[PDB]
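// run 5 | inverse folding | seed 20
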């Protein structure tokens, strides 16, 4: 599913991301826009042989099992395919784990490079929340 911006904002809000670890909902919508272009189906292979999955481009090195990243972890206890569903529950739950892991939203390269320190409330402008 390719979410709309406010559609995704609503879904992320209902699933508990707004202010989660102190990151306002705009940070999450911004990260999703630049990670996946709001596309739950997005996959992107990494040099190390892991892959990033879903709206928030969660990596198989640590977080989900894809069956082809040897010596990786599955800290979210999910198949990576779970992160590709139109239903973002798995992605959000896994994102909560990631952002709790010491490194905050710096875990997402697109958030660090395109959202951190910017006016992220813009991403939830106009939405009925
Ligand atoms: Cl915000
Ligand atoms: Cl699995
Ligand atoms: Cl959803
Ligand atoms: Cl933090
Ligand atoms: Na893994």
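// decoded
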């Amino acid at each position: 599913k390719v979410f709309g911006r406010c559609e995704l904002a609503a879904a992320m809000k209902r699933h508990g991301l707004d202010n989660y670890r102190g990151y306002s909902l705009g940070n999450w919508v911004c990260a999703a826009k630049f990670e996946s272009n709001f596309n739950t189906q997005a996959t992107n292979r990494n040099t190390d042989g892991s892959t990033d999955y879903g709206i928030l481009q969660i990596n198989s090195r640590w977080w989900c099992n894809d069956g082809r990243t040897p010596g990786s972890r599955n800290l979210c206890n999910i198949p990576c395919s779970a992160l590709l569903s139109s239903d973002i529950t798995a992605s959000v739950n896994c994102a909560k784990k990631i952002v709790s892991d010491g490194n905050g939203m710096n875990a997402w390269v697109a958030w660090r490079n395109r959202c951190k320190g910017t006016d992220v409330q813009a991403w939830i402008r106009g939405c009925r929340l």
